[PDB]
Design a protein around this nucleic acid. Sequence first.
DNA 1: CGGT
Length: 226
Amino acid sequence: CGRFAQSQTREDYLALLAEDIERDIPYDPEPIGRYNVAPGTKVLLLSERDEHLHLDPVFWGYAPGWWDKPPLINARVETAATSRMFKPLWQHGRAICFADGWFEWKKEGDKKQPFFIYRADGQPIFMAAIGSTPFERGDEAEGFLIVTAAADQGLVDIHDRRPLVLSPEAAREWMRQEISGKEASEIAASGCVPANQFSWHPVSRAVGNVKNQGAELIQPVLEVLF
DNA sequence: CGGT
């Protein structure tokens, strides 16, 4: 899930999670408009502090000072809660990245065909994230990662891993500062949306170029024309 | 010492 779409208005995503009384997020009617969100950019990221939900632009990537490789963008659910690298983020840096769906590239010979994957029921996805607090500092090296899970059922035809997508109810619980890392592991297990709830289709190869951010990038295409 |  090295690219995803976050294109609609803030209210389109937030309405499933909390009413205004629980938010500390200014009203803004403008669609976010990003059909092709990429690592290393700042992404509007949802988290809880001071008993309210906050939305901060946070760098997608995590590279502490001792990390001498490109920033990581994912953390595996199987191990993140106990990892020497990710455990503190799992405990105190949990967050949600909302989106319309995500992209994966299926290997087809020596070519790579992108697909867009989304909920068949038409709800946005609430992707489980972990990251470096305080998020509001706007760090350009230590931001957030999207937690991943194994692909299952039809999804394995496309790619072997997928974002850990949570139900709206589980997403709200995941963010709470009062719940422990162990309770968060329980939420990740119980709230994960199963593979059979997703649909997908091939999309234009144009999504590979981050200059492109338009709505056509999520439209179904004939693979033969690419 | 720490990963996808």
